[PDB]
Amino acid sequence: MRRVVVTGMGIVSSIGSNTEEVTASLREAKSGISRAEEYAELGFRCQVHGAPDIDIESLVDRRAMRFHGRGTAWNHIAMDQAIADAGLTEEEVSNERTGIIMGSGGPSTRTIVDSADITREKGPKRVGPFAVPKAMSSTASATLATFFKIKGINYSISSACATSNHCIGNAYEMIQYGKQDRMFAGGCEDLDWTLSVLFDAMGAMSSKYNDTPSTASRAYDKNRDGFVIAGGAGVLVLEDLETALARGAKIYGEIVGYGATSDGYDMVAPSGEGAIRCMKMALSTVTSKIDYINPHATSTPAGDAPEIEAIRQIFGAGDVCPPIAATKSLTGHSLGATGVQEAIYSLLMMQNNFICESAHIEELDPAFADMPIVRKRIDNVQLNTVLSNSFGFGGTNATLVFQRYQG
Amino acid sequence: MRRVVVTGMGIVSSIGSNTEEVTASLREAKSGISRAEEYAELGFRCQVHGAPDIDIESLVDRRAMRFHGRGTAWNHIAMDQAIADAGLTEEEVSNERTGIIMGSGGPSTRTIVDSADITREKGPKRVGPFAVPKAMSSTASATLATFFKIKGINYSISSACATSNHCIGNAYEMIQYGKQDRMFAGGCEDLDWTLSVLFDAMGAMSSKYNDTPSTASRAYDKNRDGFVIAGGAGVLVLEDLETALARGAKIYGEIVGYGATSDGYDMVAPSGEGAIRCMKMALSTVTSKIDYINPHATSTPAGDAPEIEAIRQIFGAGDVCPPIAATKSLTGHSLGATGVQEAIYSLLMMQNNFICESAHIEELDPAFADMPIVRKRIDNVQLNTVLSNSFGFGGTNATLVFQRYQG
Ligand SMILES: Cc1cccc2c(N)ccnc12
Ligand SMILES: Cc1cccc2c(N)ccnc12
Ligand SMILES: [Cl-]
Ligand SMILES: [Cl-]
Ligand code: NA
Ligand code: NA
Ligand code: NA
Ligand code: NA
């Protein structure tokens, strides 16, 4: 099997509109969470969100927007960034050896609702002719494959909050097996009340910090009370190692492990044992120690703890366990975009020799007092191997391991 | 790479609620298309659909339905059928070597719309706590993986009308590469006005045959005027050959080729050249002649023709080209479910030594007069290798080739 490297990155996040902004937010523990006035107006319990701050119309032209919902428009921006970062020519983007696996946890719920409303108010014709590619689950792959003239693989994987970890992992497999030489991999999610209300209704989102929105997401805090929803996108350019070396690519890291398993247990709550099998699967092909864990940890009572137990089972407790820092405390949870964004955060930390604080821990949950949860940013540290978990509703687990390339 | 066989099938279709019913409809060219009174009431141009006729509550118990939209409920039925057909034990369904790749072209649009309506009329709490797993793009994999206690791979692929062909192909790869020994693969789609209107609004669906609904879908007819939308589901059980042989499995066929490519051209219209590359990819691993083509052909002016040209380019014209019969003329188009259902139709035709009529051709389009489009059912024919195309919006192409197992 061939070796596979990351040669370019792009991102739209609640903590920045490019990799430089995101790096600055990570370093300074600057929260991306703000008040969602619209949620309050509609009567939600949770009134916080992680909203990107980016001018779409300035970055994607009107005709290029015809088939984009907002999530996929953010994904288009991230794809332009990743192409520019990788320094790819048009021929390197558009060829039979180059594909795309790009997903979202849902399609444009906004498009679906607006369409139903306008059908009933003004008639079906007034939905307009461009709604299907926004509303279908493959929206992220379809829109980008068509616009960027992708000729190789083209489809979406979805797996809830695991979505873009599986997209990256499957794209890794395509290259390992020799089916493609370059892949664009990642995903996106719109941020819209028509999606967010589904989570508010299940009581899944934070509601006791509405008056201090910036600290509402607080993985590992004793008083965590649910996740904070976000939108955005991310893209990695992946290449077989020979392709990357021969063109003088930047190598942000090598993908050295991928795990994918299923709990077969509960729709919302993780089992823990599935996560253990997923991490062991990712680690089975890794020879070096892990220097940093980017957990799934979403700031929920029932979710943060089984993952910590799974980490304990594999790595042990205390100083022998890799440092753990939950980026969702700053970013919230962007569903389909989470996995790829967390890959990017981890690669940017590796590039810049620091591990961010696991933010907003005012009082550590005593269940986790034995674990190396990062309470203050760690500087001047050389990270060589990093592990990121994403887990999703339906007991779906994905883990990725990235390594600094040194030959 | 390991050999991979189909050991069980399940189906919910507009032309039958199990494989026996479906076989009878294929043999007798019995249309599954009927009047959609609701579409007429809402002011649609198209007033026809392909609706399954199946009593869900009699086949899936109430607690088991908690997280199902109607499409995934049909998918659950198809999964029960496929497990029963394969004769699998509980241990054979639930183990680390057994996974699920199960998709839909969209999630439950009904759930999304109902949720938005009830939020605005009665408040967010009244959405209830079970909406997310119905509304997310991974609904088919999440619900079934959780209920059937799947422990291996668990995710969805989506690619519009290519969805379940890619699900089967990726599951085939998992087994070929040795990552899993058994996979449940397929997909589903609900049938609901909140999805159908999106297609009516683009003018994509048949509207000139509303007074004769049974003949509205008519691939290759000179007067075809758009596709007819349908709902349903299908499931294949896939196994590595040694696993299948050792347990005395039924072998409905061996998967011997898979193609997946991208047009990189137009969002709605196929390019043709992408399809040629996809078929060549599927055929690159096939040594036998193709005895039957199950085309993508959806009964659209702009879609049926480029595929015919691509077939001509690969296979030639006239008698040297494999017989072509468009099952969508009977079934309509079930979006996420199409691929797997067409695999099942093709395997059932192979099992029963016949090729169905390509139905409702009152006047053949003269552009296709040189091609072996089946005008009357062909009996007493031994089919050994069959090819099925599914293509999707966003220029996404998938082709599967199945072969009668003879060693
Ligand atoms: C199995 C296991 C446990 C803890 C750490 C590991 C590592 N760093 C590489 C591979 N396997 C590992
Ligand atoms: C390339 C090509 C053209 C036509 C038929 C074929 C077949 N039956 C197997 C493999 N390749 C083929
Ligand atoms: Cl459950
Ligand atoms: Cl286009
Ligand atoms: Na309105
Ligand atoms: Na992570
Ligand atoms: Na109402
Ligand atoms: Na087909």
Automatic annotation (TrEMBL), chains A, B:
GO molecular function: 3-oxoacyl-[acyl-carrier-protein] synthase activity
Name under which the protein is recorded: 3-oxoacyl-[acyl-carrier-protein] synthase 1
Origin: domain of life: Bacteria
Similarity comment: Belongs to the thiolase-like superfamily. Beta-ketoacyl-ACP synthases family.
Subcellular location: Cytoplasm
Catalysed reaction equations from the record: (3Z)-decenoyl-[ACP] + malonyl-[ACP] + H(+) = 3-oxo-(5Z)-dodecenoyl-[ACP] + holo-[ACP] + CO2; a fatty acyl-[ACP] + malonyl-[ACP] + H(+) = a 3-oxoacyl-[ACP] + holo-[ACP] + CO2
Organism: Brucella abortus (strain 2308)
Assigned keywords, A-Z: Acyltransferase, Cytoplasm, Fatty acid biosynthesis, Fatty acid metabolism, Lipid biosynthesis, Lipid metabolism, Transferase
Pfam families named among the record's database cross-references: ketoacyl-synt, Ketoacyl-synt_C
